Every structure is written in structure tokens, then in C-alpha cells.
Amino acid sequence: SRRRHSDENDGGQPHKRRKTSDANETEDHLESLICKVGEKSACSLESNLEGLAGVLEADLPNYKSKILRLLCTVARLLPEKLTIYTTLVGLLNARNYNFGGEFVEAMIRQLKESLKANNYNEAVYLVRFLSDLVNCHVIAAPSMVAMFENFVSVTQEEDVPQVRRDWYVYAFLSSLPWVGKELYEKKDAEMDRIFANTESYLKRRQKTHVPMLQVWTADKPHPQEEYLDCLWAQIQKLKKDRWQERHILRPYLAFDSILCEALQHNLPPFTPPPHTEDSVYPMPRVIFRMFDYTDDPEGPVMPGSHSVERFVIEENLHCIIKSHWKERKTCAAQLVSYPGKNKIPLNYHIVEVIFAELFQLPAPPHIDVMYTTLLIELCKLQPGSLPQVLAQATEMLYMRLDTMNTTCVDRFINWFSHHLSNFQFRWSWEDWSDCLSQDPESPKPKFVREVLEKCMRLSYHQRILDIVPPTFSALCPANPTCIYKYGDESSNSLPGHSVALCLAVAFKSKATNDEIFSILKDVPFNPLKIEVFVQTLLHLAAKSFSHSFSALAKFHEVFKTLAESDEGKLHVLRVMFEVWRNHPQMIAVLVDKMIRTQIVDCAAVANWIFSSELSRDFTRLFVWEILHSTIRKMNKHVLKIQKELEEAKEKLARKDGVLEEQIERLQEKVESAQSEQKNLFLVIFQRFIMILTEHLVRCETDGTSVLTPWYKNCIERLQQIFLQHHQIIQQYMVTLENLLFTAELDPHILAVFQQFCALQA
Amino acid sequence: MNQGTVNWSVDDIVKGINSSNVENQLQATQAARKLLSREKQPPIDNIIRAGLIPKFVSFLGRTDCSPIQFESAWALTNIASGTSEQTKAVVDGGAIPAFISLLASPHAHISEQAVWALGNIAGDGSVFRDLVIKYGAVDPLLALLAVSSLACGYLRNLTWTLSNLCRNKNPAPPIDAVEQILPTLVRLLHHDDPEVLADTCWAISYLTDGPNERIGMVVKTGVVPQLVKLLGASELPIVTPALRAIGNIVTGTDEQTQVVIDAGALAVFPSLLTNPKTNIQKEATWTMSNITAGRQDQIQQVVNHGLVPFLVSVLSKADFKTQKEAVWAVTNYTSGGTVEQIVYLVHCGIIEPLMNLLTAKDTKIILVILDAISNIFQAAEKLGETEKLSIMIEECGGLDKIEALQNHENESVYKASLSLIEKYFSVE
Amino acid sequence: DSYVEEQEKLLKKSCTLYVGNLSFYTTEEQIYELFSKSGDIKKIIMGLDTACGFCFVEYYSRADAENAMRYINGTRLDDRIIRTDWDAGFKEGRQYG
């Protein structure tokens, strides 16, 4: 009846398997091949692209998904290699139509994700990639013309920010140097139409942001143009030139035969993702410009300010730094090996793009110090030609100091002095003699003074006095000695003189807090008590930074007691400054320790910065360095408490009870931290508004000119608060608009708040 | 010099493995792995003879050095992928306890590799299977499969290794191990990957290949309807094992066979009986032959689903190996069937294709057919249609074939054919 | 990034750099000014036997110390090429050489 399977096998499946390949290893190898194509090779680029297209094609059956992944990534992460990868995709497309169609779908997909996650800067690379794929017979030009139509239509939405409209326009005009010719060849009537729309929009845009973002206000020798006005002139010059440009390298031109055989794909209609309350767009920009061909008469002719070559070159070099900024040797190497269709003065472009980055407003793309070490690496790499370009560039930045934005001037000062410290401080000071007979308050003599102060901080007083010509001695910094009020100046009649003597004797034999408190009771909130204590203590620790930190620590209890009140914190700072006014660096490090150990707080320091005692030094760099350092500590404190609260919640997913209570107490400390930060900004703005108003009202009443050196500095320091902390300050719109920067505010001051608003409007 | 780690001599591997510098070791280990995964004639014995296993086993534990765990895991996988002596060497190296430890690695590529190795080791047979289970391989393995979405490779590797813990007999896997494995198999049976499904079916087909207790643990799980659904899958790799499982299940009790009928098996059969893949035809008709050994009400469901004309076609037109199964199906049917059921079978044209196989060179099959004939004559007696059946058999040449069996070499065939001649073909 | 076992763990969370090849005359104040260019300094400890040609620099966050390893390391102060490395952390006694 019933029968088990016979020929008694269990089906004959393999009993064992030997591992003969590895998916990861293959995927890593593919990624390496894709990332490396275009690098130096014994074989030509074209040769390597055909080979690679062959290796990739043969791996499609098993790794297509991966290969697609890799090429999209290269598309958004390596824009400087654009035409290399579009060529590669073009080869794949010619061999495989489905792959191409599939790649294009993957690209539009990724584009939409980037846009939704507010990754607009990457999105532009993706868009440029789609554009160049038209040259590689992968995408039909009319479908590209059509997507750009929807882009420009963004200029049409109602109730959306200028920066949103702006981007879409930018991504479109941006692509034209790559695909301008093709799109205008196939659809010239319709391209003329979009240029009409686009143009009318540019004319309509507001330029409220421009003064906040220019590196120089002066129109000559080079205007610093708003980024879209400039790009539009470049495109318009490209159009007059029949869409011929002389720079971009296009490896696909060598595959004319293969690519003409292939079949194109159409892009689907594209709906720009609608603006939502959560969307964030790039800030507008002003094009940094300092060179023209006359600056390099011996070199190949420099492309003009209004050529698409200048735009592409600079774009690619910024992208090179973005890819390699963490590794300076590699970064320098990539910059110097940047290729092009025709010869260009590469050393001028590199130097110009680096300064474009360091001087960018609101902020450089990367930490300021990187630019210094990068330019040093480039000087070692190109020792025969790059240093002369950098010296020349320096002489040019100097000569144009007069309308340079304060924020940039600070960076120029910090860069130049740090650079010089790497080269024995060698510089031709007499070239800058013009500055010796100008008002000491004007930008040039001010810059020279601040530079020499910085150089002294990287060495020492006598060194600096020794390297400048005798005629610059007036601009040299003071000997950083401390001033002891109760020293050997026969002034026994000063109040607390004898208490100061007791204090000194007690410190020198090693005092305790209780002992110091005891002596201080003999003083007539007690300002005089603070004065004698601080004067004597700082004086006895004057030898070095760590002697001083040591004193602040040892007698921390006395500081915290004497400065419990707000007037106490203020008086400590005031007396500290009377002691160490000749030594700004010591002032900075002491203010830092006092805040970190709560002898004083951020509000006290803000008030102190704007106090009458600091008035003579108010336009000096060290003052603004201290203020910003104080703000940075407030900001970092808030972040730290936020981070701790986020991890307590994340960890919540007796042990429970204890954690919930800790969360509650953390939430309570965040609100307190955030309120302290808001106050600090509020105080800073209130003081700026009050002292700017005093100036403007006095000048207009008295019939004198508003625009003085003092004013240039004060208005731009206010500007500078907004530039460095805009993300934080945007949290305070309602308060600022209602209570500080109101409609009645003198327009000179209001304008700065408006310029700030114009960054994300 | 060598080029990187391609094609080192054993001697180089030995010197690099026996070095103080782990980077030397990591390169030698990789060199061994490349030798072991090469297309042609991996030198397994040479590597074993060079005393490398223990070192390889050490490396599995070098927690700190992620890369060398992987290269060694991959090496030992390829050694154990060979013959019984080669896998026993890996096992004697203490590799089992150490691969299980790796199942918990934070690096997915390493645990995945430990899964593959344990799979090769269990795949050797019942002893190493048991040996693997007893080291506690099961808990962690199943631990990896809780709450997709892992990578494909990874899932397939896990499923394949589980299917080896389910496989082989004498003895069958420990019952308790099976009961803990099964719930995972049930969920894997509902996954979407073709290869995971193929191997989950194999796994189940292994568990159902045993006595009524074993069959009943699979049945009680509720998987049969899903097995029956996979019989219709367009992928042959999945149909085959699903069909084998369903086939093993109906070798069980009538109640267990009822479960597969209840799940829709009979509606797929017409498709499997005419499947151009003859292995499928053969297995399906085998399966049917065990269904028709069931109760009269089950035979009736075979009838009501129109399966008989299909059995007659297979009896007539299929290759011999499939015809043998159909002979069994027909004879079981005639053995348990009611009179009306036999009548219908005769009406479907059973006699001729049945008598045609009396020339078979297979004496066992000849005895089964004569049994069927005897069964059908017993139905004929109750109906008084004995003569009509005789003439039916006579008219298609069936009597000539039964008489020829009088001179058959086999004594049983002679006795059974004589008995038929005597009772029904000797009119006075 | 190329400028950035139990010890391979410590270093990867460290915030302090050991700094060598310094001129014997380079001062704590100068180190403050140079090293602050990558972020805020918690403490500096000068190496002694008088001045010894090395120091420790401890930042408040790792990011700032990574930036010094990338951009201050390998530059030239008082004509000496500055050489920094990750340090497991200062311990008392380690400031003598």
C-alpha cells in the first residue's frame, strides 16, 4: 500500500558548498575602479573609459544595482569629475539601453531626495550631470529643455522666498556651459522664451543682501557682483559666442562613433517639490573678484570676469577643495593638476579661489586655518611660480583695504601674520609706507598695527620691533608688561594702599582664602576691596599664563565672593583690564578662565565690552575676539545640554523612574541655558543700537559726517554678529522685530537687520 | 616574489602564519584562502598537512583583528567543504565551538561566514550535524533570524545551514532541535526570495521524510497550505522540494493525508501530472499512489477532482519509471476502493494500458498488476459481471499476456497468473 | 582623512596632543596663540628637564584636536617644524624629559 521514496535519496541537493567569490570584495573593487578612473595612468583617459565600460557591462548581471548606486554617488559627490562619469554612463548606455534608462531614473529619484532633505548644493551637481548626459546621447534635449522650464516656473509660485526661486534659476543657468549649445540647437525659440522669463525675474529680484555680503564696497578695480547677475552676464556672453566655450574637457567627443549609435532617453515631467515651512535654501552669494588678465601679462590670457570659463574653472576648484580639504597635501596636489582644454593661468585661479573661500560672507566653507596651511603646501609644491603670485595677491589685498568688510579684514590679518610666522616674518614693509602718513584710524595703518600685534603673539615683542623698519616703530605693539597700581610709585595716599601691602606680603608667604578675606575686611559689593585684591593678585602672578590661572584657581573662593553681584563681576573685569591693558592676549585668556569657572558670566563680559573703560580700544581686534569667544562658549554650552537631554530620552527605550526625573531636570536646564543665550544676544544688540544711535543722532544734530572710521567699524561689527550666528539669531525674529529692530529705528541700523533677513528670504 | 597574495607556496603561508607580526599573518591567511577558493583543485590536503588548522582556529578568536577572523573563517569553510576526512580535520581543530562564538560577531560578514562553515560541517552527515547542534549552534542561528530585513546572501546562507541541521537520517535530527527550528522555517516559507523558499522547502522535505511522529510535527505547524501553494510556483527549484515534502507527508496517516487534500493538493495535480518535467510527473504520481492507499472517501475526492483520467494517461503514455508509480496508484485504488469506484476506474479505460505493462522486465511490477486485476475481479463478482470483465481482458490481448506468464522464470508470477487463469478463464 | 589595542581605543577618543620638535625658547603663550587657531584650549603643559622642546595641549572637544592634527601639525614655529601626535592623556611625571 503506502511506499516511501525509493532509490533512497533525499533529492540530491549539494551537501556542502565551497566559497569561490565574495560579493563585498567585488563591490569594493568596482567602487575602486569607478572612483579612480581619470587618475594618472600609463594609458589615456579614453582608453581607460572604454575598458571600464567593458568591465562594468560584464558585471551587470549580478552587480547592476551596486553599479547604479556607485555612479549616482559619483554623480553627486564628484562634480569636478563630471564629464568623465557622464562619458562613462554614455558608453554603458550605448552598450545597454535599459541600464541607461535605469540610471536616469535613479538620478531623478536621488535628485528628489536631495531636494527634500534640503541638500540643494548637491542637487545642483545632479542637475548638471543630467544636463551633460544630453551631450552623451543619453538624454533627449527637448526633455531637458522641458525640465528647465518647470525650474524657471518656480519664479512663479506665490508666497515663497526669493532664495527658493533663486536656486532653481541658478541650477538652470549653471548647467548651460555644459549643454547650452545642444539645447539651443534643438529648441532655440523655446530657449529664447525661458531666457525672457528668467531675465524679467532677475530684473525683479531684490538686492538687499548685497552690502552685507561683498568683500569690498568699492566698484574699482573690480565690482563684487551678486551671484546671479554675474552668471547671467556670463551666459549672455556664451550666447553671443554661439555657445562655444574654450575650457571644459569632454571625453565623449572621442566617442563620437559609439555615442551616435546609441539611443536617448526622455526625462519625465518634473514637479519641483513644493516649498514647505521646513525647507531651507542656500543663502545668496557675491562673487569674489581680484584678478584680471592685466595682473598676469606673462601668462596665458586670463579668461574674463564675464566668461563661462572663469565660472567653470572656479566652480571646479571649489569642488576640489570640498573633496580634499581634510588632507592638505592631496588637496594641493589635485588643485595643481587641474586640467583644461586650453592653457590658463592656474596659479592665479588657485590663489583667487582660496581667498574667495577665506573671505566668503557669512563664513568660509571650512575652518579658517586650513586655508593657511593649504597655501603653504601649494608654495612647497610649486616653489618656482606660486609664491610670487601669492606675494602679488597680498600686495593687492593691502592696496584695496579701504572698502574691505571688517569681518574679512580680521581673516586677512589672521592669515597673513600666521603665514609670515612660517617664514621668519619676512616681508617688505617699506612697500606699505603709504600707511605711515595716513590717519592711524584708517584701514591700512590699522591693518598693519593689528598684523604686528598678531605677529608678536606668535613670537615676542623684541622680535617684532627688530623685523620692521625703524619708521614703523610707531605701528609696533606695546611691551606687554602689567601695570601695578600700588607698585613702587610713592603714592602712599591712594585708598587701600596699606591693605595692598598686607595682601602682597600675605600672597608672597603663601596665603589661604580665609587669610585674604581677613585682610580685606580692613578696606573702607565693595569696589575698593575688589580693586586691591585683583591688582595685587594679578601683579604677583604676572610672570606667565599658568601662574595666573593658578592664582585664579587658588583664590577662586575670593573671586566668587567678591563678584557674587553683577556690579562685582563688572568691577573684576574693569580692574583686570587696568592691570593688563598692554597685554591683550592675557586679557583674552583670563576672561576665558573667569567665564569657564564662573567668576564672571557672559552678560557681564558683553556689558564690559561696551563699557566706557573700553571705549578707546573698541575698534581693536582683540576686543571682538574676546566677545566672539564668549558667545561661542554660550552656544557650545546650550548644545552640550541639548545633547545630554537627547541621549537621556534616547536611553529611555526604579531605573525608569530615576531616568525620567533626570530628563525633567535636563529639560529644565535646557530652557534655562537657552534663555541665557537669548539674553546675551539681546544685550549685545541693545548696546549696539544704543551706541550707534548716539553717534548718528549727534552727527546729524551737529551737522558732521556720519561716516567715520569709528562708525565703519561699529556698523560692521554689528553686521558681524549677524553673519557669525545667523542660525541662532533666526530663533529670535519675533523678539528682535518687536522690541529691538523696530520700524522707527534709525534706518542705518535697521538696514543691517534687513540685510540679515534678506539672507533666508 | 609573489604578486600580492595571489598563488603563494604553502611554505610562504606557513612562514607568514608563524610570524609575530599580525600583518604578516593576515597576509598569509589571505594567501591560504585564495589558494582554497581557486577554481581548480584547491590544495586542501597540503594545507591540512602543513598543520594550519589550529592556527586557523586560533585566528577565529583573535577578536581584535576583524580581517583575520574573516580570512580564516573563509579558509576553514573551504577545507570543510571537501571530503569527510577534510571536514573531520576542521572539527578536530575545535572549529565548531569557535564558529558558534563568531555567530555573535558585530561584523555581519564574519558571522555570515561562520554560518556557512557550520553549514558545511553539518552537511557532512548525521554525526557532525548532531555534533554541531550539541555545541549549541541552534539558539544563536535562530537568534540571527528574528523580527528580513537582512541582506539576501545572508538570509540564503542562514536558510541553507538550517536546512542541513534538518537533514539526514540514522538518526534523524534530535526532536527538540526540530521543534525549535520549525517556527523559523514556517516564517521562512512565507518570505519572497526564490532561493530562500527553495531551501526552506528542502528543509521541510527532510523533516517529513520519516515516521508518523516526524510528519506530525510538520503538519501541526500549519504549513501544509503554504506547501500546496508553492507547488504552483513557476520556479522548478521550488516545486521539486515542495512536491517532495507533500509526497512525504501522505506516506503518513490517513489523517495526515487528509490535511494535504484539505489544503488543495488535488487541484494542482492535473498540472503536475502533465508537467513536461518527467521527474515531476514521477513524483506527483508517486504521491497520488499514496493518496489512493487512503480511505474510500479520500479515493472519492481523487475521483471528484477528475484525477483518474490523468492516471490512465500517465499509465499509457509516460516513461516506465512514471508508469510504475501509476501501476501502484491504480492497484492501491483497486485495493481500498468501493465497487462503484472500481466501476468508474474500468470506465476510464484502465484495463488495456494495465495489460500492456505485463511485458515489463520488472517482476515486482508484474505482481502488482496481477494484484490489481485480482482486485477488479473481486468487484466484478459482487456485481455478477465477471464474464464481461473476462471478455474485456481477452479482447485487448490481456488473456494472451496472462497465459504467457505461465512460462515466466519467476515462481510468484507463475502462481499468480495461474490463479487468475483458473478462477476466471476456465469456463466449463 | 590621513592626518588624524586598548590604546588604539584611548587615542581615538583623546582630546590631547603631544607636541614635539619645539624650539627650546618657544613659550606657553605662543603655543596658546598657535594652537587656538583650531579651537579652544583647556590646558597646556610645557615639557621640562628648564625648557625641553615639547608640550601637551588639551582641547575641550576632539574635533578641535583633529583640526590641529590636520592643520597645525607639520607647520613651522620659531623655524622648527612642529610635530604632533595623539596622546593617551597627560599623567603626572610626563612633563619631564
Q: The domain that contains B86 carries what CATH number?
A: 1.25.10.10
Q: What distances in angstroms separate CA B428 from CA A519, A553, B381, B400, B423, one per listed residue? A: 150, 134, 17, 19, 11
Cα angle, residue B244 at apex, residues B239 and B245 outer, rounded to 5°: 100
A629 touches C: beta carbon within 8 Å: yes
Determine whether the annotation assigns residue C32 to a binding site. Answer: no
Identify from C66, C75, C90 which residue to disrupt to test chain A contact, counting A C-beta atoms within 10 A and taking the largest count. C75
Nearest to A530 by CA among A497, A473, A571: A571
Q: Which of C28, C36, C43 is the best mutation test for A, with the most CBs of A within 10 A?
A: C36
The answer to whether residues B199 and B156 touch, using CB atoms and an 8 Å cutoff, is yes
**Dihedral pair phi/psi, residue A727, rounded to 5°:** -60, -40
Domain boundary among A480, A501, A535: A480
Residues of chain A with a following break (C to N over 2.5 Å): 524, 653
Residue in A with minimal Cα distance to B38: A20
Read off the CATH number of the domain in which A540 is found.
1.25.40.180
Resolution (A): 2.2
Contacts of A696 (CB under 8 A, 6+ apart): A706, A746, A748, A749
Alpha carbon of residue A168 to chain centroid: 23
Length of chain A: 761
Rounded to the nearest angstrom, the gap between the alpha carbon of residue A242 and the centroid of all alpha carbons in its chain is 37
CA distance linking residue A122 with residue A74, whole number of Å: 11
- Domain final position from A463, A480, A497: A480
How far is residue B248's CA from residue A295's CA, in Å, rounded to a whole number? 90
To the nearest 10°, report the CA torsion of B376, B381, B387, B389. Answer: -20
Q: Is A414 part of the contact surface with chain C (CB cutoff 8 Å)? A: yes
Q: Choose, out of B5, B72, B74, B78, the residue to mutate when testing the contact with A (most A CBs < 10 Å).
A: B78
Residue B51: CB atoms within 10 Å:
12
Q: How many CA atoms lie within 13 A of A668 on its CB side?
A: 6
Q: Which distant-in-sequence residues (6+ apart) come within 8 Å of A583 by Cβ?
A: A480, A481, A482
Rounded-to-integer distance, Cα B120 and Cα C39, Å:
56
Cα dist. A710→A446, A451, A577, A717, A756 in Å? 12, 19, 21, 11, 22
Range of the domain at B28: 1-428
Q: Are the beta carbons of B289 and B251 closer than 8 angstroms?
A: no
Find the closest chain A residue to B70 by CA distance: A22
Q: Which residues on adjacent β-strands are paired with residue A139? A: A265
Question: Under a CB-based contact definition with an 8 Å cutoff, are residues A17 and B81 in contact?
Answer: yes
Residues of A in contact with C3 (CB under 8 A): 326-328
Nearest to A435 by CA among A421, A449, A423, A419: A449
Spatial separation of the C-alpha atoms in residues A236 and A144, rounded to whole Å: 20
State whether A525 and A473 are in the same domain.
no
Distance (Å) from the C-alpha of residue C12 to the closest C-alpha of chain A? 17
Looking at the structure, tell me whether residues A3 and A128 fall in a common domain. Answer: yes
For A11, the closest of B39, B81, B244 (CB atoms) is: B244
CA distances in angstroms from B175 to A263, A457, B182, B251, listed in the order given = 61, 80, 10, 19
Domain that holds residue A391: 289-480
Report the DSSP pairing between strands C51-59 and C16-20. antiparallel
Q: Answer whether C29 sits within 8 Å of A546, measured CB to CB.
A: no
DSSP-based three-state secondary structure for A314: helix
- Closest CB from A3, A11, A15 relative to B289: A3
Cell numbers standing for residue A340: 583644461
Which residue(s) pair with C91 in the sheet?
none
Breaks in chain B at C–N > 2.5 Å: after which residues?
Answer: 147
A11 in contact with B at a CB cutoff of 8 Å?
yes
Cβ contact, residue pair A422, C70, below 8 Å: no
| Residue corresponding to grid cell 591693558 | A581
A26 has a chain C CB within 8 A of its CB: no
Whether residues A544 and A680 share a domain: the answer is yes
B153 CB neighbours in chain A (<8 A) are 23
Contacts of B248 in chain A (CB under 8 A): 4-5
Please, what is the Cα angle at A87 between A85 and A90, to 5 degrees?
Answer: 110
- Looking at the fold, whether A364 and A268 belong to one and the same domain comes out as no
Confirm whether residue C49 is marked as ligand binding: no
Provide the grid cell at B417: 497468473
Total of domains in chain B: 1
Which three cell numbers, joined as nine digits, stand for A226? 551678486
| A654 and A602 part of one domain | yes
Spatial separation of the C-alpha atoms in residues A307 and A128, rounded to whole Å: 18
Cα distance between residue A678 and residue B350, in whole Å: 97
- Gap between the Cα atoms of B69 and A752, Å rounded: 62
Chain C contact residues (CB < 8 Å to A) = 1-4, 27-30, 32-34, 37-38, 40, 44, 60, 67, 70-72, 74-79
Element of type H or E holding C76: strand C76-77
Question: Is C95 among the annotated ligand-binding positions?
Answer: yes
Of A369, A459, A633, the CB nearest to C71: A369
Measured in angstroms, the CA of C29 and the nearest CA of chain A are apart by 7
Cell readout for C37 is 587657531
Closest chain A C-alpha to B117 CA, distance in angstroms: 9
Q: C70: which chain A residues are within 8 Å (Cβ-Cβ)?
A: 326-328, 370, 373
- The verdict on a CB contact (< 8 Å) between B202 and A18 is no
The answer to whether C71 is annotated as binding is no
Residue C96 counted as an annotated binding residue:
yes
Contacts of B240 in chain A (CB under 8 A): 11
Quickly tell me which residue has 577643495 as its cell.
A321
Set of cell numbers at residue A40: 594618472
**Maximum C-alpha span of chain A:** 129
A522 and A440, same structural domain? no
Residue of A nearest to C44 (CA): A546
Indicate if A602 and A751 belong to the same structural domain.
yes
Nearest to A89 by CA among A110, A112, A106, A114: A106
Any CB–CB contact under 8 A between B30 and chain A?
Answer: no
Distance in angstroms (rounded) separating the CA atoms of residues A406 and A618:
13
- Helices C28-35 and A545-554: angle between axes, nearest 10 degrees: 90
Please give the grid coordinates belonging to residue A7.
532509490
Q: Which amino acid is at A727?
A: Q
Is there a single domain that holds both residue A141 and residue A274?
A: yes
B80 vs B96: CA distance, rounded Å: 11
A497 lies in the same domain as A421? no
Partners of chain A (3+ Cβ pairs below 8 A):
B, C
Q: Flag whether residue A24 sits within 8 Å of chain B, measured between CB atoms.
A: yes
Contacting residues of C for A328, CB less than 8 Å apart: 3, 70-71
Q: Residue A358 corresponds to which amino acid?
A: L
Residues in chain B: 428
Residue A450: how many CB atoms within 10 A of its CB?
22
Give dist(CA A8, CA B304) in Å, integer.
33
Q: CB–CB of B353/B345 below 8 Å? A: no
SS3 B381: helix
Q: Which of C2, C37, C78 sits opposite A418 (nearest CB)?
A: C37
- Count: domains in chain A: 3
Rg (C-alpha) for chain A, rounded Å, is: 32
CB contact under 8 A, B251 and A24: no
Q: Which of A3, A19, A20 to mutate to test the interface with B (most CBs of B within 10 A)?
A: A19
**Phi first, then psi: what are they for B92, rounded to 5°?**
-70, -20
CATH of the domain spanning C1-97, picked from 1.10.40.30, 1.10.1040.10, 3.30.70.330, 3.20.20.30: 3.30.70.330
**Could you tell me if A269 and A302 lie in one domain?**
no
- Which residue, of A240, A257, A288, is where some domain finishes? A288
Asked if the C-beta of A121 comes within 8 angstroms of chain C's C-beta atoms, the answer is: no
Residues of C in contact with A332 (CB under 8 A): none
Least Cα separation, residue A21 to chain B (angstroms): 7
Closest by CA to A523, choosing from A552, A494, A487, A560, is A494
Q: Which long-range contacts (CB under 8 A, 24 or more apart) does A46-49 make?
A: A46/A251, A46/A254, A46/A255, A49/A84, A49/A87, A49/A88, A49/A91, A49/A251, A49/A255
Q: How many CB pairs under 8 A join A and B?
A: 70
Contact A180, A238 (CB under 8 A): yes
State yes or no: C70 annotated in a binding site. no
Q: At what angle do helices B152-165 and B175-188 cross, to 10 degrees?
A: 150
Taking CB atoms and an 8 Å limit, are C75 and A422 in contact across chains? yes
Torsional class of B362: left (φ above 0), alpha (ψ -120 to 50), beta (otherwise): beta
Report the chain A residue with the minimal C-alpha distance to residue B295: A1
Q: How many CB atoms lie within 10 A of CB A208?
A: 17
Three-state DSSP at A465 gives helix
Q: Are B103 and B132 in contact (CB under 8 A)?
A: no
Residue A13 Cα, gap to closest chain B Cα (Å): 8
* Interchain CB distance below 8 Å, A328 and C71: yes
Question: What letter does residue B144 receive in the DSSP assignment?
Answer: T
The amino acid present at B158, given as its one-letter code, is L
Nearest CB among A327, A422, A636 relative to C3 is that of A327
DSSP A686-709: HHHHHHHHHHHHHHHHHT--S--H
Question: Which of A741, A607, A603, A730 minimizes the C-alpha distance to A677?
Answer: A603
- C-alpha closest to that of A591 among A610, A572, A611: A572
Residues A130 and A65 in one domain: yes
Grid coordinates belonging to A68 = 547604479
Residue type, C60: Y
Dihedral, A560, A565, A567, A573 alpha carbons, nearest 10: 20
- The span from the CA of A126 to the CA of A238, in Å, is 22
Assess whether A576 and A428 both reside in one domain: no
Residue of A141, A149, A153 lying closest to A184 (CA atoms): A141
Alpha carbons A175 and A182: distance in angstroms, whole number = 11
- Cis omega (within 30 of 0) for bond into B237: no
Distance CA C35, CA C41 (A): 8
Residue C91 sits at the vertex; the CA angle it makes with C87 and C94, to the nearest 5 degrees, is: 80
Instruction: Check CB contact of B71 with chain A, cutoff 8 Å.
Output: no
